């Protein structure tokens, strides 16, 4: 009985149990309610995946959806990332070739937990590259139950992120391994993984910017080896040509100002390495200063070239969605759709402690340990940690991508303690204290997943006093009516939030979708939703609309209805038509927004108000109230 065989058996067993704990903690929305999809975004992913199942691949690549953005039509194959759809369709095809007849909605529901397992494995490998297996297994056990990654990965939520975190962790593992080994094979594998990441999510910008940043800091620390050259140059070239293949990316790796750090560090690295070669071959006493000065001049010249090409207009500037992360006040003023969404708002410490129980405290200790022992990969880890902390500190939605590094760092820290004291009274008390903290972490994660993030928005649940639960199922009722009691070519008008959900459930032609790529169309819809009946009727006649859908949550206590989202309609419509719609007009002369007799008569004759309050002045509940 060699301890090596039992050690490897224990490692395999603990990875399998981490897989099973990651798969089993994500079923609190399937045990209850039903195995259907939940949020607004996963419906489009589902619909296009269904198309890929029933028409093949070359039909999905050329797919011109005419049942969305009605008068315009949406080119789906060329304005979407085909990474989630292709993976779901491939698993569906493999699973139906073996005569295991599973419907594709079940694959779309249960795709995310399966990939959570692979994410745990990827974290294990990436942490084993930095520290001993112990930290690897501890990090694989940390990111399978952590609530920061469960939130937008629970079974039924079929979005870009479940695949994206796996691909991101695996690309980072492969780049660390390639830099350590120096081989071209690991760089080719890393390039293929980066191509997959490009096809999956719009978070490849983070990968490509982080890799130049790591290489540049390796240059400033005077740690330039030949392996870094053979890694980064091959990675950049192969990954560039691979990234240009996706239709939605296209030629953006050249024109955009997000992919210019990579070309900058590539040029600087070529110059640096040529000058160092010359230095080795020529005498050191003479021409040394000339070599130092030349490196500095090359870097300055690359910076000047980038500035000039950005300024003249050859290189397009940053997008607004990537510029709100720097300006931090540019969203609400100029383009209000960026500030409208609930995800694009900042994060309080409550979320940092609520998504990470003990990790957010032992995480800087692990960062400190990683700084103390410096290697080529640990510089990369430190930069990843700092960048993710900052980016998550300004946007709530992005916190998921921060969760991996935290786990890794925390694992390292905990492993460090279990290295020292484990193996009299003081050491025993230290071991029991750390183990008890881990117990508290596990119990906290289970509580948070049970009570907070396992809640669908399709079916609402109102709980009776005796513990009985009633399900308000009005969304699917109205959408099913709309599906089976209208013409096949009817056009519905709705706010952008539900644009996906109508075309997925109700299967009818919407005018404005959830994905926003033309803001003046949404401005027209907002003006129609916030004028009187005559102007709104003209707007509705010129677009050939038939039905109008409004969500009214006034009979029951539902927070987000269209009256609570009416002011953003007014602001978006004011952004493109300043002469017609005035925000100040819908407020009372005191300066507040109200629905009473004190409300403004410019709102009491609006179309949203006349539309969501029709024949409600006679609807009195049995409980004694007005």
């Amino acid at each position: 009985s060699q301890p090596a065989g039992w050690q490897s058996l224990l490692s395999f067993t603990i990875l399998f149990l981490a897989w099973l704990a990651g798969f089993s903690s994500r079923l609190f929305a399937v045990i209850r309610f039903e195995s259907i999809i939940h949020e607004f975004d996963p419906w489009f992913n589902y619909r296009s995946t269904h198309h890929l199942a029933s028409h093949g691949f070359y039909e999905f690549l050329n797919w011109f959806d005419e049942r969305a953005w009605y008068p315009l039509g949406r080119i789906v194959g060329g304005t979407v990332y085909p990474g989630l759809m292709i993976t779901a369709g491939l698993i569906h095809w493999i699973l139906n070739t073996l005569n295991i007849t599973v419907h594709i909605r079940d694959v779309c529901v249960f795709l995310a937990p399966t990939f959570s397992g692979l994410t745990s494995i990827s974290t294990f490998l990436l942490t084993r590259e930095l520290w001993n297996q112990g930290a690897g297994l501890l990090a694989a056990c940390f990111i399978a139950i952590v609530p920061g990654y469960i939130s937008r990965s629970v079974a039924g939520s079929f979005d870009n992120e479940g695949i994206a975190i796996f691909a991101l962790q695996f690309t980072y593992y492969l780049w660390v391994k390639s830099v350590k080994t120096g081989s071209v094979f690991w760089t080719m594998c890393c390039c293929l993984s980066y191509f997959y990441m490009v096809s999956a999510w719009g978070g490849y910008v983070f990968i490509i910017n982080l890799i130049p940043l790591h290489v540049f800091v390796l240059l400033l620390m005077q740690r330039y080896s030949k392996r870094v050259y053979i890694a980064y140059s091959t990675f950049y070239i192969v990954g560039l040509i691979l990234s240009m293949q996706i239709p939605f990316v296209g030629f953006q790796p050249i024109r955009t100002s997000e992919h210019m750090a990579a070309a900058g560090v590539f040029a600087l690295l070529q110059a640096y390495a040529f000058l160092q070669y010359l230095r080795d071959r020529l005498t050191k006493q003479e021409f040394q200063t000339l070599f130092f000065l030349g490196v500095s001049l090359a870097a300055g010249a690359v910076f000047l070239s980038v500035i000039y090409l950005t300024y003249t207009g050859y290189i397009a500037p940053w997008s607004g969605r990537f510029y709100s992360l720097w300006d931090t006040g540019y969203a609400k003023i100029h383009i209000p759709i960026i500030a409208s969404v609930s995800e694009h708002q900042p994060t309080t410490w409550v979320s940092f402690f609520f998504d990470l129980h003990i990790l957010v405290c032992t995480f800087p200790a692990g960062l400190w340990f990683c700084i103390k022992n410096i290697n080529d990969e640990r510089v990369f880890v430190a930069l990843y940690a700092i960048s993710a902390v900052y980016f998550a500190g300004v946007m709530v939605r992005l916190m998921l991508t921060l969760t991996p590094v935290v786990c890794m760092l925390s694992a390292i820290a905990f492993s460090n303690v279990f290295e020292h004291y484990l193996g009299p009274n003081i050491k025993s008390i230290v071991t029991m204290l750390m183990l008890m903290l881990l117990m508290m972490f596990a119990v906290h994660c289970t509580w948070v997943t049970s009570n907070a993030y396992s809640s669908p928005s399709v079916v609402l649940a109102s709980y009776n006093h005796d513990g009985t639960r009633n399900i308000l199922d009005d969304f699917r009722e109205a959408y099913f009516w709309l599906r089976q009691n209208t013409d096949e070519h009817a056009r519905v008008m709705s706010w952008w939030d539900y644009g996906y959900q109508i075309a997925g459930m109700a299967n009818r032609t919407t005018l404005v979708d959830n994905n926003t790529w033309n803001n003046s169309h949404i401005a027209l819809v907002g003006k129609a939703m916030s004028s009187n009946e005559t102007a709104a009727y003209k707007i509705m006649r010129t677009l050939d609309v038939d039905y109008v859908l409004v969500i009214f949550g006034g009979v029951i206590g539902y927070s987000g209805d269209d009256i609570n989202k009416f002011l953003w309609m007014v602001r978006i419509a004011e952004g493109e038509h300043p002469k017609d719609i005035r925000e100040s007009d819908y407020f009372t002369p005191q300066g507040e927004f109200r629905v009473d007799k004190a409300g403004s008569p410019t709102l009491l004759n609006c179309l949203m108000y006349k539309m969501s309050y029709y024949r409600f002045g006679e609807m009195q509940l049995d409980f004694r109230t007005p």
């Binding site: 949020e39 607004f40 975004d41 409208s340 969404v341 995800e343 939605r397 952008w496 989202k565 953003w568």
Partner: peptide, 7 residues
């Protein structure tokens, strides 16, 4: 945390 308008 979804893709809706902040209410």
């Amino acid at each position: 945390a979804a893709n809706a308008t902040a209410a």
